Amino acid sequence: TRPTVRPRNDVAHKQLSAFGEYVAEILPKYVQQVQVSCFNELEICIHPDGVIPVLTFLRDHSNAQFKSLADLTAVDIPTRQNRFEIVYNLLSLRFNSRIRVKTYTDELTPIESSVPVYKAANWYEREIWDMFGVFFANHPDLRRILTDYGFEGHPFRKDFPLSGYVELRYDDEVKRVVAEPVELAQEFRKFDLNSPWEAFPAYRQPP
Amino acid sequence: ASTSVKPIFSRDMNEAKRRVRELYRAWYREVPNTVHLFQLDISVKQGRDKVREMFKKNAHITDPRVVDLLVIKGKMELEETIKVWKQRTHVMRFFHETEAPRPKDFLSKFYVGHDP
Amino acid sequence: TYKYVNLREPSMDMKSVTDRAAQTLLWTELIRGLGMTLSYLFREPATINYPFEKGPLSPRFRGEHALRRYPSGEERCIACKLCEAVCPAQAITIEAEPRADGSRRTTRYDIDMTKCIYCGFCQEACPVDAIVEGPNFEFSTETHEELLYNKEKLLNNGDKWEAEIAANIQADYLYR
Amino acid sequence: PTVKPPTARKFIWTNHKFNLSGTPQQYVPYSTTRKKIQEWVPPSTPYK
Amino acid sequence: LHHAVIPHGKGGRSSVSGIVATVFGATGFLGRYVVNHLGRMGSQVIVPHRCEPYDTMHLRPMGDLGQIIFMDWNGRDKDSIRRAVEHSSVVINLVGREWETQNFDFEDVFVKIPQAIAQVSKEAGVEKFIHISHLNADIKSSSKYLRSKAVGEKEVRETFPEATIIKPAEIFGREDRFLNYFANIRWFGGVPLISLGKKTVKQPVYIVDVTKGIINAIKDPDARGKTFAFVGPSRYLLFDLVQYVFAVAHRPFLPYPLPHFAYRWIGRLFEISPFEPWTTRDKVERIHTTDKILPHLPGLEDLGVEATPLELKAIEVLRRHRTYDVQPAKTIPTS
Amino acid sequence: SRGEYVVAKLDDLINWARRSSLWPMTFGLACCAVEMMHMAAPRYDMDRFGVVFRASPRQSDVMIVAGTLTNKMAPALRKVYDQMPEPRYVVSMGSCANGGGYYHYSYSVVRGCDRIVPVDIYVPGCPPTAEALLYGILQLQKKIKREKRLRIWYRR
Amino acid sequence: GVRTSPTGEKVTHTGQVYDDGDYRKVRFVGRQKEVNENFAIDLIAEQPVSQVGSRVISCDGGGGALGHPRVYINLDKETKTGTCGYCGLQFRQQHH
Ligand SMILES: NC(=O)C1=CN([C@@H]2O[C@H](COP(=O)(O)OP(=O)(O)OC[C@H]3O[C@@H](n4cnc5c(N)ncnc54)[C@H](OP(=O)(O)O)[C@@H]3O)[C@@H](O)[C@H]2O)C=CC1
Ligand code: SF4
Ligand code: SF4
Ligand code: SF4
Ligand SMILES: [Zn+2]
């Protein structure tokens, strides 16, 4: 074998492709795309209306049994009509496999809360709200979790500046900690690192 | 179909305004308790005028979905004050007591710097 | 493979049951714990007599950044700015221009020792062994401004610790 | 050092100095670069 | 001049305001607010201090890195004064004391020391000089505090003609000795007052207003060689003013009269304390002296500062004195 | 005997008592708190200098800020500092507390604890070794040894 | 080497010195200005020019892996010497 190249596992690539088709045949109403990566991970892309149907099927079906929610997060892409891509990472102790379920939304369209399916989603959805501003409908307790009280904006959005808009300080006159517009003694320096030469022709896009 | 979207709480501006007013009543009746629990140095009248100013800024919204979010944030900001999750510093950040006034006219901006 | 940690069935014979009655009434396993602390009372403590004794370190230790010279006295740095590019904290600032004799040399070399994460990437990126982290770890100050090093402070450190810096690099450069 | 003395270089400090914080010998930071923009100097002779 | 210091930025903590100021007596009540306002805009502040460095620690967070610089100085040493002022563009004098010590008397701190600073500032080339006199300064006053103020107010006006002399009334604030003075009398049962507090009228001013006035006098070119009178917006009787304080503090109020000579007798008793005396014969004079009216001098409004009522910010100062709405005291209309 | 001689020796007695019984209140916020625990561990044993392991805020003489100070945490820090009985000193431990360190350019981090409270000693490193924090503590002891409170009161 | 300005403040090897009327000098009152006394431009000028008998010579700074990247220098011009771009040492061809 090649000492420096990661080996391929064609067996697990064939098994995850069979199961991806299996899922898309059972939920045509919701599944829009199923893809398997070159390092054997399975992605089910769904319409946002199927968050509860699709997840419930994967948790409870006898051939899926994805009983553990590994993680739930969001990704921000400003160039899409629906900026926010919601990602569910799931685990199956019965079949020793993982699967990724993805949907989408925007600043104003809500998504159904997953707490009924996974009690683990309670805090993850608050974090997506706090950091991205995606509203989850029917959440038992939705509010900021990580940012400071009274914080304005959603810091993980691609257009929110790195250093924010305000900074804290102690003022002796008013005997408390105050908030003021941010001025930096040394401005963060921006490096343009990307090389002007194509790195990977396998991922080239049509012109 | 492009303009057909899912609502948050209100299906039209008329229902949205109902939520705006209920929120305003909640804030109006809390200022006396807030000015007392946090031992603020402002008066109740100053507190109730700040609430009025905050509502006035977003008075030109005509999107029911946007208004729903503003109410959702308002209810979140309200729950923090009632339960004393905020502190005196957080409440007083609405007033900007330690920031010098910044001029609004062209000549004054010309003398100090380059910003428009 | 797996093992159970707490899946034992206690015996219910009279002798075993009486053994646990003596343990409950006469506090046997509590006095077994007093004995262990008694043993440590007679063991030699592990304390060292700082500042007259010091904790052991190794030639790879990462302490106070410093700027080195060639054996002729010429500065090693040639203002390549690789260290400034790799520093994950952006703690380094550099400015350069041709020197009076035409050499490529810096006119500014600052390290903010309060942004710095003391990671060692600056000395891995350097192609000429100019910026190093020395073995000094006792340089606490009384004001914030004394920790903003400029090129003069960094060159003074290099001249001050060259005897020890060179010996450490001699001891480890075969692993790099 | 007695058994294995260090290499000798003419630029190495001969007199070691301990920590100098809080004394008149403390280090004070400053910019090592010169002025960037030169300002125009008005003429010293009246024009009329 | 080749050029000024060319202010840059947005007026924040890391900006450059072009103000290099030396503040004498910056470790007291008034200097704690002047240094904060100078550092809040990005000014270079040199703070010559006589006390232990531990006692200047509250000033360090008031400026960015390297904007607050501390030096040692001696009141009678001219060389120490020179080191602190030869790099500055404005010098502010806040040196003062409400009692005479073993080594310094009212003459030393209000005449000789202000004269030394003014003379050395002139010889060093400082441009703006700001001296802090008193509103009730008068060489014909029963208080030696107020007599020395007048003498110093003149020798400064002669040594540095282009000085901006600020004459405030009694200042009130969190760390004041004016409202905090009419709240610790409770420790002695009743509230003594001369003539039951009648016949005395006071015009106290807010600390922040006096501080904002000082800053605007530095930046205003029309304040060189001019004298101001920073006074509050209302005039009160010494009785109802003290009555108001005890109402806000929510403490029992027993105002009983005491003759002038008796008050001095108890005044001398406290002066024996080798620490900060609770009260002194001199302090009693100024507390029972009526605040003057000088309409011919510019006031706060001429510097753009709007005077702050004592009612809006009395609670801020007296909140601490409360154990475990108050009706405002009456005022004296201007005829 | 002279007054300047009694005050000089009284200053040495109060300084000796204060620097020999520093009771710290440790604000363990982040990784720097781990190195602070190794200073209390048997290898270095801060307690043998008189520096007790843990002290309550009202029984403490020094505050050690060990970790990243966030904007959601700053008001709590100032409150604890204002309630410390005097004399009180603050030791800033690590790059995060000194100037923000790795998170300097973050929106939720206070760039240095010295803009919230006054600071007496800065201990650099990320984290400082347990022998580097100990060196800083012994440097605060010498600073307290140079105090002249009584010798300045006598000259007022 | 270090030479002092008319006001008594030393000049660094980069040429930095505060003018007489610059307020920034106040940071040095009761303190000192850190200046390194070993000017590298003077130190490398004392090194002798090394005579070699080839058109092209190589420099690695000395110490092998402890020096600088190895570069080859051309000595075809007799008007000037060959200078190393890294360490500043000079080389010359022997009469040809
Ligand atoms: N406070 C008020 O109500 C009024 C103030 N003023 C005047 O304003 C000025 C500020 O006073 P204020 O801050 O309010 O009260 P403070 O007494 O608290 O301030 C006095 C300052 O002057 C210093 N000082 C006193 N004597 C000397 C000396 N020999 N040498 C050096 N410094 C000395 C003190 O330094 P240190 O603490 O180290 O001893 C202190 O910093 C005074 O001149 C006062 O006359 C006038 C009208 C109202
Ligand atoms: S040790 Fe790391 S963070 Fe510190 S200066 Fe070097 S590269 Fe930058
Ligand atoms: S990597 Fe080395 S040679 Fe390059 S700029 Fe940094 S210190 Fe100088
Ligand atoms: S300074 Fe370093 S070790 Fe300390 S809290 Fe920050 S990142 Fe962690
Ligand atoms: Zn070379």
Tell me the overall shape of chain C. Answer: elongated
How large is the radius of gyration of chain C?
29 Å
Major β-sheet profile of chain B: none
Count of distinct structural domains of chain B:
1
**Portion of residues in helices of chain C?**
25-40%
- Report how far the terminal alpha carbons of chain C are from each other: 40 Å
**Helix/sheet category of chain C:** alpha+beta
- Gap between N and C termini of chain B, in Å? 42 Å
Q: What ligands can be seen in this structure? A: NADPH dihydro-nicotinamide-adenine-dinucleotide phosphate, iron/sulfur cluster, zinc ion
Instruction: Count every helix of chain B, treating DSSP H or I runs of 4 or more residues as helices.
Output: 5
Number of helices of chain C: 5
The fraction of residues in strands of chain B falls at: under 5%
What is the multimeric organization of the chains shown?
Answer: part of a larger assembly
Number of strands of chain B: 0
Give the strand line-up of the largest sheet of chain C. Answer: 2-3-5
The radius of gyration of chain B is: 18 Å
Class from secondary-structure proportions of chain B: mainly alpha
Beta-strand segment tally of chain C: 5
Which pair of chains forms the biggest interface, and how many residues does each contribute? C-F, 29 and 34 residues
Main location (chain B): mitochondrion
InterPro entries (chain B): Complex1_LYR_NDUFA6_LYRM6 (IPR045299), NADH_Ub_cplx-1_asu_su-6 (IPR016488)
Keywords (chain B): Acetylation, Electron transport, Membrane, Mitochondrion, Mitochondrion inner membrane, Respiratory chain, Transport
Organism (chain B): Bos taurus
Describe this structure in words.
It is classed as membrane protein. The entry lists the keywords Complex I, Oxidoreductase, Proteoliposomes, Membrane-bound, metabolism, membrane protein. Outward-facing, open2 proteoliposome complex I at 2.6 A, after deactivation treatment. Initially purified in LMNG. This is part of a larger assembly, with seven protein chains of seven kinds. By secondary structure, chain A is an alpha/beta fold. Chain A is 19% helix and 26% strand. Chain A has helices at residues 10-26, 51-60, 121-132, and strands spanning 31-36, 42-46, 68-76, 84-92, 97-105, 111-112, 136-137, 166-171, 176-181. The longest helix of chain C is centred in the last third of the chain and has 22 residues, at 151-172. The two termini of chain C are 40 Å apart. In chain C, a hairpin with a 5-residue loop joins β2 (92-98) and β3. With 176 residues, chain C is of the alpha+beta class. Chain C has helices at residues 14-26, 28-41, 82-86, 121-125, 151-172, and strands spanning 65-67, 92-98, 104-112, 131-133, 148-149. Chain C is elongated. With 48 residues, chain D is largely without helices or strands. Chain D is elongated. With 335 residues, chain E is an alpha/beta fold. Chain E has one domain. The radius of gyration of chain E is 20 Å and the shape is globular. Classes of the chains: A alpha/beta (207), B mainly alpha (116), C alpha+beta (176), D little secondary structure (48), E alpha/beta (335), F alpha/beta (156), G mainly beta (96). Chains D and F meet through loops of D and loops of F. Bound molecules: NADPH dihydro-nicotinamide-adenine-dinucleotide phosphate, iron/sulfur cluster (3 copies) and zinc ion (ZN).
